[PDB]
Amino acid sequence: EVVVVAKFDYVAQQEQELDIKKNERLWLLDDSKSWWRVRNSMNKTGFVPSNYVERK
Amino acid sequence: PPPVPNPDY
């Protein structure tokens, strides 16, 4: 039930990463490391840089 | 914008 909002665009460079756009809302799934695992509104998941998203 | 952290996922 935790939301993050992207602060910057991120174009994925590996299969496990996720493309995000600035202002996109995402579900936060795992915040244990410096890259966080998120789910988007297309029901896709992947890792993004934790400093590119803001916990709401 | 800042650099990404070193990936360790």
Numbering used by the authors:
A (entry chain A): 2 to 57
B (entry chain D): 180 to 188
Reproduce text from the manuscript describing this model.
Nck proteins are composed of three N-terminal SH3 domains and a single C-terminal SH2 domain (reviewed in Ref.
The complex of Nck1-SH3.1 with minimal CD3ϵ peptide 180PPPVPNPDY188 was crystallized from the same conditions as the apo-form but in orthorhombic space group I212121 with different packing interactions. Slight structural changes compared with the apo-SH3.1 domain are apparent (RMSD 0.45 Å). The most prominent, peptide-induced structural changes pertain to the side chains of SH3.1 residues Phe-11, Trp-38, Phe-50, Pro-52, Asn-54, and Tyr-55. A notable exception is CD3ϵ side chain Tyr-188 hydrogen-bonding to Nck1 side chain Glu-20. Thus, selectivity of CD3ϵ for Nck-SH3.1 is established mainly by hydrophobic contacts from residues in the SH3.1 domain acting on the CD3ϵ hotspots Val-183, Pro-184, Pro-186, and Tyr-188.
